[PDB]
Amino acid sequence: KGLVPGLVNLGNTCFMNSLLQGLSACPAFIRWLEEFTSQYSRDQKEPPQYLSLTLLHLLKALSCQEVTDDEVLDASCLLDVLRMYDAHELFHVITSSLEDERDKSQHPFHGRLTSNMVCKHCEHQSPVRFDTFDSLSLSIPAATWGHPLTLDHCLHHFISSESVRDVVCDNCTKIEAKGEKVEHQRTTFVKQLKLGKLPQCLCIHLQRLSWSSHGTPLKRHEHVQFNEDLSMDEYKLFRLMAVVVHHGDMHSGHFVTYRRSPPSPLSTSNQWLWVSDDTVRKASLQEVLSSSAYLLFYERV
Template sequence: MSWCGPEATDELLREFFRTRSSARNRMMKNWGVIGGIAAAMAVGVYVLWGPSADRKKRRRGMVPGLMNLGNTCFLNALLQGLATCPSLISWLQDFTTNSSSCLFGMECGQTSEQTDAQTSMQTEMQTDTQTSMQTETQTNSRVSKTLLQLLAALSSPDPGEDDVLDAGCLLEALRLHRWHISSFEEQDAHELFHVLTSTLEEERERQPRVAHLFDMETLEKSAEASENPASCWSRGPLHPVPSLWRTQHPFHGRLTSYMACKRCERQSPVRYDSFESLSLSFPAVQWGRPVTLDQCLQHFISSETIKEVECENCTEKQAKTEDSRVLESQRTTFVKQLKLGKLPQCLCIHLQRLTWSPEGAPIKRHEYVQFSEYLSMDRYKHSSATQKAGRSKKPTAEEPHDQNGVDPEHHNNNKPLSNGSISSAFLRSGALGPQLDLVHDFR
């Protein structure tokens, strides 16, 4: 048996380490190949089954979202509520379409009436006039067109290009009407609602009151609008044909108010005031019990007692009994009644959760408000028969009424107020009758 020397041992060790290093290098190369294959497979899976441009489109039946441009939650909440009002969308479509057709009819009529005797200077002046009129009309209807585009995209069941909408264009359109609304500051949604309605009313007022003679499409639509046109028995001149876009927006309604003297029972004429939303305060209820919408409406129309009001009828009667001597004006107690004279097509209700304590500190009401599925407005409407019956009945102090005012002379302050803590509920009225269908719930 031969023994290995030191040289042979060193040679064996070097051969062993050399073989191990080559095996390790081959193993690292194999791992590199495996990693490259795995990366290629991952890229292939991402390309074949990964997200595509088509998947960004909104699916059918899904509601798109609204981008928050800073602190524009008030704007997004209002637009989402308005998108559930088909009457408003229909009115905007008619308004924008008819105002555009009026301008188109004027341009076509002027072009067809041109003769060969017109000079080139007259043609240029006419073209400049038409261009300026078109630009002014587009500016005047900027808010209505922008609002229609946003509401149509929010309410359309068909999938759109994007699932997120940017409502900043509406703020830009409002700024053209001199409204300074910052998207980085918290605003009041109720105040923004009145800004929109007043701007729409302003654009409506800028439209011509009667249809143009060359706007044959509008004239024909006006004649065919009613299936049973009423006959005119007057021999006087006929009224001008009303324009279709001159109709009020669906939030426009009218309130009636009248006052009656408790002493002489004389009742003042009924006064009609326009409104776009009803600001309802909370009635006094037992702690822990919910508040219903009917209670808020009943509290809104409850009678209001006003003291120390000058009554001309009582003064005249007193003068007759005192041998026509000059007497001071008689001041008595009046009862003021508020009701709904004309229901809007879409009723907007603003719940006033901000109240004031006797010490003057602001208090927020946290009561839950119950909404029924159907809301009957018969009891809140003004009726001429009820008014005539009320003239023969002397108002008494025993008549129930809520006393929620802080002023001792005015027990019930029912005037709509704007505050910073609000919630709006939109109610859609049916085609027949005063019954309203509930669209939104409120908590």
């Protein structure tokens, strides 16, 4: 019975159980947590009041690295430590709080980013900006009958086709201000990106949350094709480890996670699992790939 422990869900902690199950599938994050909490074990072991210690022992039990006799784990201690200081924003909350505790080495999700904005009517380039990312949040383009949506299409749109109209072109504005007759062209800007350092744990986020004209939240259920292997050479090799899937609508939905089985070491298992909080069942790669991914966790091979 090669299964992972489950997680209790009293009613509204799916967004965390789904993320935790996925984070336990990235062995380098867990290894970085161990070497980070080594500082607290210098004197005695510090069994407490620390977020990294609470997260590590959860991920170590979920990845079957620590012997667990309870067939279900309870992660409520992680939520209480967060409150004293959407599964995607929780990911950004956890990574930020771990960085504040470290303020050592950067967590394997940390990447570097170089960005530039170019006007679509005169090709004027904005000043180059330097950024960091812990995840690549991608837009989902428009669908079409007989035209399937792929993750690569989303990655190309994210790199050189992302539109932004929070800015205006200085060249087109000076020109339009002339003694003649000049028509105002629609301000269209594209944000051309180029990734610098690729992190060894890659998180890809598909933006499924939209907003109507009256402020009501909308969900895009369109399927995005992805594979267990993802090459990032065209944007400069990653293996899919887990997938966070959101079912239902924005109001009465539910978070679930597909994840790989824990290794029998360093060799990634081909056995996928379906984890809905406390329920853990075996699954096939065909089921994983047929789902509408919300968060994709990869690892550099």
